[PDB]
């Protein structure tokens, strides 16, 4: 059934699973026509498909050409997401296919279910968690590869860099969701915190800076403050 606070540790057991977030698949800038009416112009999007145990990210880039001449694009985006996730599963060896797929938005359930009819033993699950994966496009390297794409393209990342050499999956997922929650609530402040010290760099093969354990504790604490703050600045508390 649905994934929630009660069954959170299930994410880090040894059953292969993937989160699918579709919030950045269909992206537009809304603007004005010469006649003063409003039009949208699409920009490149991405499906965010993530193994929460290993950190492997399957970033399917959605090129704006896929929308050409199509109607009802927000509905199409959900079905295009499900088509691409099903294609990814079929591309994997059987022993690498997930046993569950968890969609971050419930409107993806029926599209994914129908595209995965060939896979009756892969459970499609919603979740009650309000996960911050929409903020993936605030990670500069992921944003950069999406915007530069000139054709459909799959790019593979590890969203945990090398963290699993020192911390568990539970702890790495918690750090990731904290970082992303901060970038979502105040991207500018969040990015200031991550780069403030010019001596800590981002390795070419990494997404995040190379913090020591002590520096991660400092960073994580600065991110919590920002989140509570914005929760005050928002609500006035």
């Amino acid at each position: 059934g649905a994934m929630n606070s009660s069954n959170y540790a299930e994410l880090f057991n040894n059953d292969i699973k993937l989160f699918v977030d579709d919030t950045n698949v269909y992206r537009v800038t809304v603007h004005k026509t010469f006649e003063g009416n409003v039009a949208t112009k699409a920009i490149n999007g991405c499906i965010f498909t993530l193994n929460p145990k290993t950190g492997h990210l399957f970033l399917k880039i959605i090129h704006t050409s896929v929308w050409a001449g199509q109607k009802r694009l927000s509905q199409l985006a959900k079905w295009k997401t499900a088509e691409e996730v099903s294609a990814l599963v079929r591309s994997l060896p059987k022993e690498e296919q997930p046993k569950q797929i968890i969609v971050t938005r419930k409107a993806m359930l029926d599209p994914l279910e129908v595209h995965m009819l060939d896979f009756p033993n892969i459970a499609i699950r919603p979740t009650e968690l309000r996960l911050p994966f929409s903020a993936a496009m605030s990670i500069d390297k992921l944003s950069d590869v999406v915007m530069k794409a000139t054709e459909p393209q799959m790019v593979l990342f590890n969203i945990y860099d090398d963290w699993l050499d020192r911390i568990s999956s539970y702890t790495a997922f918690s750090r990731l969701t904290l970082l992303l929650r901060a970038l979502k609530t105040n991207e500018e402040s969040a990015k200031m915190i991550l780069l403030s010290d010019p001596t800590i760099t981002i390795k070419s093969y990494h997404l995040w800076p190379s913090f020591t354990d002590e520096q991660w504790i400092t960073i994580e604490s600065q991110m919590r403050d920002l989140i509570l703050t914005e929760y005050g600045r928002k609500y006035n508390v």
Partner: protein, 300 residues
């Protein structure tokens, strides 16, 4: 005009024939039902005074044989049986009619309610849904489950309705996932009409039979089946014009005949709102929409 005589009525029971129902007292001198119109299927059904649990009854066609009812005190129900001896039967019936011990199926139907509810229902199709080949008539009751319900137990007692499942490989062409799920015309017209049912008359007959079992026996799986067959039409953008017009007449008479106090259970809000107001056919069911609005606007 045909007759279904009763040996006796040893227990107090409510007996219904079609949309008519009447009460019989324990050991009342009741010996059956005469003047039954020829040319239609019929259903005789029973609800005991002492255990309203289990409504049950028998679908039959008097052209296919001479049928009678007899209470069985071991199995505790009114059983339909066939009399093979034609002259033994006319004699039984004639003597009962002479003693005026049979109620008469009422002659005037200004709106022909029963024809309109059974227009496409044939005995031969009923007998394929309800499998018991040694009898010319078909037993149905409140508790019988459908094949599809059994998938999600005793098969000899199942309702073998046609399985409809909107998230199934039968319903969804590979490569047309979105198209086929949002517009079920290929599942309606190619899979079901051309492939399985062969024509719309047979589709409508199963839809009508499912409704009637839902209404007369409170059979839950039958109600599920009725609504799924409606939803499959309403969710198809491409439906033969004759089918849409006929469907409007079909549903109109079903909603007209439904007990006003059973709409809480036998009508599925989601299906009806989608069918009358959101589906491709939201504008093609004027009479059904008119009577649903003037009779169950709460549900909507």
């Amino acid at each position: 005009m045909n007759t279904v005589p009763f040996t006796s009525a040893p227990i107090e029971v409510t007996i219904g024939i079609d949309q008519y129902s009447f009460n019989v007292k324990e050991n009342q001198p009741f010996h059956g039902i005469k003047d039954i119109p020829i040319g239609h299927v019929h259903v005789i059904h029973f609800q005991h005074a002492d255990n309203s649990s289990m409504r049950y009854g028998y679908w039959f066609d008097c052209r296919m044989g001479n049928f009678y009812i007899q209470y069985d005190p071991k199995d505790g129900l009114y059983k339909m049986m066939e009399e093979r001896d034609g002259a033994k039967f006319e004699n039984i019936v004639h003597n009962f009619k002479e003693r005026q011990m049979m109620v008469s199926y009422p002659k005037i139907d200004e709106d022909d309610t029963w024809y309109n509810l059974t227009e496409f229902v044939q005995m031969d199709k009923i007998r394929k849904i309800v499998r018991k080949d040694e009898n010319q008539f078909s037993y149905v009751d409140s508790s019988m489950t459908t094949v599809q319900e059994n998938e999600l137990s005793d098969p000899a007692h199942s309702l073998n309705y046609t399985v409809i499942n909107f998230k199934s490989r039968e319903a969804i062409r590979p490569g047309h996932e979105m198209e086929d799920f949002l517009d079920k015309s290929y599942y309606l017209n190619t899979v079901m009409l051309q492939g399985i049912f062969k024509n719309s008359s047979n589709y409508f007959g199963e839809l009508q039979f499912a409704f009637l079992n839902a209404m007369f026996f409170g059979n839950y799986g039958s109600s599920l089946q009725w609504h799924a067959m409606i939803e499959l039409i309403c969710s198809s953008a491409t439906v033969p014009k004759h089918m849409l017009d006929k469907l409007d007449e079909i549903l109109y008479y079903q909603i007209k005949t439904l007990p006003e106090q059973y709409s809480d259970i036998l009508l599925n809000e989601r299906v009806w709102n989608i069918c009358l107001y959101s589906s491709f056919q939201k504008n093609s069911l004027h009479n059904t929409e008119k009577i649903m609005e003037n009779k169950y606007p709460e549900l909507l």
